[PDB]
Design a protein around this ligand. Structure first.
Ligand SMILES: Nc1ncnc2c1ncn2[C@@H]1O[C@@H]2COP(=O)(O)O[C@H]2[C@H]1O
Ligand SMILES: [Mg+2]
Length: 324
């Protein structure tokens, strides 16, 4: 059912070595993978090797897994292969800066979860799928696309020579699949609001306990949100270019809605592009800023993400003022 990489693809990835200059730059939170397209698969291998060890996964299986995942991301403007590696890199930076706070199993599970969090995304939102009673919406009632992403991830692991997790004990195998399932589902932004509220209460009252599994799950959920939204933590030019991709995809969804007799919300209406700056301002105030603020309280080393987010919020305000 899943698309499979060619022998040339996975065998070639096995020979990749990250350039020395990038080895330094990749550790920074603001790192933009954008100008290194041919290196994206290799960049992911590198991050897994540094965070989990060069022998954590059998190289051949890891390369097949990565290239088949790439092949199963579609040609959509935003939720594509580039996005997958970008989100995985943000997780890499978070994990690197909070290394011993997370178990070996959690680090490997989370890096894989990020690479696969939007696997086989079709360019359509959950709102579209549920508003048009799409098959996927009947099965996966809530977090529709996210449940599909997890199912597709398991499907790729089931491909011959692709199960990088088979060497784990039966207990840890089940454990990592659960970590991955919860992490991918957490990228359904609808769940973010309640999760952040709960974490803020736990933090403020002092009940937050990282040794409490239910609490760990929530912190990991917030981390996934922070990574999924990380385009807002890059340098302004990069943030602005990515925003163009985000809207390109949403406008295409809006176009399809119009064709079917349903008017899209302003955000997905390309004829309302002038409202984008205010739309982003609202998003930063309602989602981004609160997200990174809570993340930084829980994990101090992630402060750079919050600083960058605040900087971009100021940039959007500048646009609104006419200082673009
Ligand atoms: N700059 C942004 N980056 C990411 N998501 C955004 C942004 N602005 C608005 N959003 C909304 O937040 C959602 C985050 O997850 P999605 O990418 O599924 O869909 C995104 C949009 O609905
Ligand atoms: Mg998604």
């Amino acid at each position: 059912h899943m698309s499979i990489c060619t022998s040339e693809e996975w065998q070639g990835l096995m020979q990749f070595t990250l350039p020395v200059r990038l080895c330094k730059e990749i550790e920074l939170f603001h790192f933009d993978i954008g100008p290194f397209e041919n290196m994206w698969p290799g960049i992911f291998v590198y991050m897994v090797h540094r965070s989990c060890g060069t022998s954590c996964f059998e190289l051949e299986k890891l390369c097949r897994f990565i290239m088949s995942v790439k092949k199963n991301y579609r040609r959509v403007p935003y939720h594509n292969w580039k996005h997958a590696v970008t989100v995985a890199h943000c997780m890499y930076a978070i994990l690197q800066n909070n290394h011993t706070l997370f178990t070996d199993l959690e680090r490997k599970g989370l890096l894989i979860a990020c690479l696969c969090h939007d696997l086989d995304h079709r360019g359509f939102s959950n709102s579209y799928l549920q508003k048009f009673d799409h098959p996927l919406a009947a099965l996966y009632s809530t977090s529709t696309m996210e449940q599909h992403h997890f199912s597709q991830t398991v499907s790729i692991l089931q491909l011959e020579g692709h199960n990088i997790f088979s060497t784990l004990s039966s207990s840890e195998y089940e454990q990592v699949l659960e970590i991955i399932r919860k992490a991918i589902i957490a990228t359904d932004l609808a769940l973010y609001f309640g999760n952040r509220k709960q974490l803020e209460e736990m933090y403020q009252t002092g009940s937050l306990n990282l040794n409490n599994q239910s609490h760990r799950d929530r912190v990991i959920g917030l981390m996934m949100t922070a990574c999924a939204l990380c385009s807002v933590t890059k340098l302004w030019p990069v943030t602005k270019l990515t925003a163009n991709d985000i809207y390109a995809e949403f406008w295409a969804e809006g176009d399809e809605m119009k064709k079917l007799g349903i008017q899209p919300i302003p955000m997905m209406d390309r004829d309302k592009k002038d409202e984008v700056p205010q739309g982003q301002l609202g998003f930063y105030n309602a989602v981004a800023i609160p997200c990174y603020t809570t993340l930084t309280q829980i994990l101090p080393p992630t402060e750079p993400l919050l600083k960058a987010c605040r900087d971009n919020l100021s940039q959007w305000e500048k646009v609104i003022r006419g200082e673009e």
